[PDB]
Design a protein around this ligand. Structure first.
Ligand SMILES: [Ca+2]
Ligand code: NA
Length: 804
């Protein structure tokens, strides 16, 4: 029994707020309470629906601006907010006047919004090591969010990332929990105000700290993957940001997409209630992530009692909110969700809305914090962001002290990222992936080239832009801006650490310039360290710039001298992530037993250093199968879920249950890709089968072959379990007890099993290709296929072949 510390020691309840909550609850219907718990998204919600139901909140999802615009004036935002506000205050139809609130993700500023200041993504902020800077970024963020009429912003993100292959690595301040703990509370107080007289007042927003918990610890860094760690490790590594965020009175916590030791966090009452609420003492409300409830066992897009019962208070159900609402109401009335649970949810959420002041403030457009449209993209905020850019940069290499570069020089700027704001901003920047962004999507932003050109012009130097490294007058030095393309979430999941392993385009450019005897300073844009020994060798200087955001001139500020030729700003950033020396150092973290990084956590050169980096090793580390379930069901194949009391259920989708909706539950899990696996839970006697739709004789091609599959056993079957292979109602080719290979599976992770079909004591057409039977078991299956010979990494569940 892991002891988690009680950290809710500063924020005290407000007796008046609690009185209002209770007076409201005593009179509310089940329908109204549930209504408080449901959150639609603006791409799917109408004003009419808000009027009818009075949802407790609604989401600015980012895919569209209000009214369908890509761009909208602040006034337009405020009109939309007013419309929803008035629809919620209308007690016609729904019978009550509880003000709704608008929520939005604030990944690096109010980053869904055209024209908003874009701060550097978290990895660079972590490199900055500046808590006051973080707090100020929070205050600026609060103002820019308020300027669009939004009361509730999701920040900070407190993931602690342990495997850089994750596509969300840049959203984390550090691989190390300590930095995240220092930062989280600063961001929270920056947004919400300090605990005390100004708590949640004025321009301060309601904040949500994301995500609880362990999403930066999934196996191989697979997005929404499986976090395999004991509870003490979850506490000591992945939860540090929540200690300070909860301590500072964060009003909301968002649950995480990943699973913990095979079980989805969104359905885990131990984590979301006992740990988060009871032990840590969190007094605010839990919001789910985007349709996360659909991944919970027994749940789907339109229903999820388990998540609610586990401790989720507000359900982010952007599209299917209406059906979800009615189902949840029927579930509360049926007793499968106790009213005390919805009461508690409503208390926790109303505690936030009421203390923020939804009853005391006017409609959005008339509020004091709504009278400053200039807050959105404010010059002052861009100055702050520029400071953040300067402090985020980490100087990895500076041979013969080539940096800083004389501003009066003739400089060539090259590389695909030289004048591409979309690359410097990364994902979650106006659009989701950022791929389709061009410079015109970032008004008032400054590309890196533009900043350099501005300062070089002021200093009387010469500058040329050519992505491909073309020049007329041979330059004194070339600044080459290269890096990853923008990405978000699983789109950014990678398997290889080597930069551009498929093309090595940037390397070619660098070597070309080096071959012309031109000194090379590389500005590297990325959401994470990557293996770049080759590019490092082709560079005289090399700067990790991360994803700096809108203020690209922050780069010039550090790389160039002023007009007089003197240093204007030195490097200050230090690695918050370890930099890999080899292309397979996937889990390189400070305090690791074997810690052999190229550049350690905390490394960063300055102009005061006279260090050369030597040439580094550029050496890298080193058929006819018939698919049944590889990534998806093959033709003529279906799942079957059979319990004791009802007809067998044929399922072909991402999830399902047996007839009794309780005994056997199927969900989707993530081995490598999204939803390439299926997880299963036996709570009572039941049989799962991977079955042919029409009984099919075994293909002679595989008569002396193998059924091969990948299996993870989260919890070993207490009452035993049975694995049958190639069955025909009358009998099966193989019948294997789980107890007989349990020691292979005791790491609770995936294994590739090969199961020979031709054994001693070996007819009929096959109806169940695979069949698993148990009263109590938890596992996941993936990549089920017929093979002629066992794959290399496979383990054989063998048999006597004496007869052959
Ligand atoms: Ca690391
Ligand atoms: Na209402």
């Amino acid at each position: 029994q892991v002891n988690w510390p009680y950290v809710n020691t500063k924020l005290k309840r407000d007796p008046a707020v609690e009185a209002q909550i209770e007076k409201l609850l005593a009179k509310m219907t089940i329908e109204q309470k549930v209504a408080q718990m449901i959150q639609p998204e603006i791409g799917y919600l109408t004003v009419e629906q808000m009027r009818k139901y009075g949802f407790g909140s609604y989401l600015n999802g980012g895919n569209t601006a209000p009214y369908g615009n890509k761009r909208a004036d602040q006034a337009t935002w405020l009109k939309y907010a007013d419309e929803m506000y008035l629809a919620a205050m209308d007690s016609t139809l729904d019978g009550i006047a509880i003000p709704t609130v608008w929520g939005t993700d604030a990944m690096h500023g109010h980053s869904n919004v055209y024209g908003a200041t874009l701060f550097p993504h978290n990895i660079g902020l972590g490199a900055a090591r500046d808590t006051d800077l973080i707090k100020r970024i929070g205050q600026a963020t609060a103002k820019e969010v308020a300027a669009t009429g939004i009361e509730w912003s999701f920040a900070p993100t407190v993931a602690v990332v342990r495997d850089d292959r994750w596509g969300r690595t840049y959203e984390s301040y550090s691989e190390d929990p300590d930095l995240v703990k220092r930062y989280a509370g600063e961001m929270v107080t920056g947004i919400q105000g300090d605990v005390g007289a100004d708590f949640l007042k004025g321009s301060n927003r309601i904040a949500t700290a994301k995500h609880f918990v362990g999403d930066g610890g999934t196996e191989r860094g697979v997005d929404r993957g499986n976090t395999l760690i004991d509870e003490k490790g979850l506490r000591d590594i992945h939860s540090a940001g929540y200690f300070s965020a909860i301590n500072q009175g964060v009003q909301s916590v968002m649950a995480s997409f990943n699973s913990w030791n095979g079980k989805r966090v969104h359905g885990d009452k131990h984590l979301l209630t006992d740990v988060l609420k009871n032990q840590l003492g969190f007094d605010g409300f839990v919001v789910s992530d985007w349709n996360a409830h659909k991944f919970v066992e027994g749940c789907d897009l339109e229903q999820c009692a388990q998540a609610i019962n586990a401790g989720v208070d507000v359900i982010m159900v952007p599209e299917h909110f209406e059906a979800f609402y009615h189902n949840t109401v029927k579930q509360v009335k049926a007793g499968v969700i106790a009213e005390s649970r919805i009461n508690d949810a409503v208390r926790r959420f109303l505690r936030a809305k009421i203390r923020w002041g939804v009853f005391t403030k006017s409609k959005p457009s008339a509020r004091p914090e709504s009278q400053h449209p200039q807050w959105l993209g404010a010059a002052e905020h861009r100055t702050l962001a520029r400071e953040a850019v300067r402090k985020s940069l980490v100087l990895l290499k500076n041979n013969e002290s080539i940096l800083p570069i004389k501003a009066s020089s003739r400089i060539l700027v090259a590389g695909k990222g030289a004048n591409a704001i979309n690359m410097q901003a990364g994902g979650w920047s106006v659009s989701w992936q950022g791929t389709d962004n061009t410079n015109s999507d970032f008004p008032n932003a400054t590309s890196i080239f533009s900043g350099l050109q501005s300062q070089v012009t002021k200093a009387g130097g010469k500058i040329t832009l050519s992505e491909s490294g073309e020049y007329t007058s041979k330059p004194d030095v070339a600044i080459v801006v290269i890096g990853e393309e923008p990405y978000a979430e699983w789109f950014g999941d990678i398997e290889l650490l080597e930069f551009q392993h498929e093309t090595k385009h940037a390397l070619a450019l660098l070597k070309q310039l080096k071959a012309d005897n031109i000194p090379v300073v590389t500005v590297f844009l990325s959401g994470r360290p990557l293996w770049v020994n080759k590019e490092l060798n082709a560079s005289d200087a090399f700067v990790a710039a991360w994803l700096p955001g809108s203020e690209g001139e922050g780069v010039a500020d550090v790389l160039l001298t002023n007009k007089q030729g003197k240093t204007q700003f030195d490097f200050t950033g230090k690695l918050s992530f370890s930099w890999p020396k080899y292309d397979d150092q996937f889990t390189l973290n400070l305090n690791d037993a074997d810690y052999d990084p190229l550049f350690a956590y905390g490394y960063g050169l300055t102009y005061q250093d006279n260090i050369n980096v030597p040439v580094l090793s550029e050496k890298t580390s080193p058929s006819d199968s018939h698919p049944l379930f590889v990534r998806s069901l093959a033709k003529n194949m279906t799942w079957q879920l059979a319990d004791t009391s009802t007809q067998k259920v044929l399922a072909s989708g991402a999830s399902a249950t047996s007839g009794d909706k309780q005994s056997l539950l199927m969900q989707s899990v993530n081995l490598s890709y999204q939803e390439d696996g299926r997880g299963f839970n036996w709570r009572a006697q039941a049989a799962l089968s991977l079955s042919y739709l029409e009984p099919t004789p075994l293909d002679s091609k595989f008569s002396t072959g193998y059924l091969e599959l990948k299996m993870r056993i989260d919890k070993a079957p207490e009452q035993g379990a049975n694995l049958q292979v190639m069955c025909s109602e009358s009998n099966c080719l193989r019948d294997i007890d789980f107890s007989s290979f349990s020691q292979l599976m005791a790491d609770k992770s995936w294994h590739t099993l090969a199961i020979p079909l031709h054994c001693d004591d070996s007819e009929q057409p096959i109806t169940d290709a695979l069949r698993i039977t148990s009263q109590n078991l938890s596992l996941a299956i993936a990549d089920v296929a017929l093979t002629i010979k066992p794959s290399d990494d496979s383990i054989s569940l063998t048999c006597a072949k004496l007869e052959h």
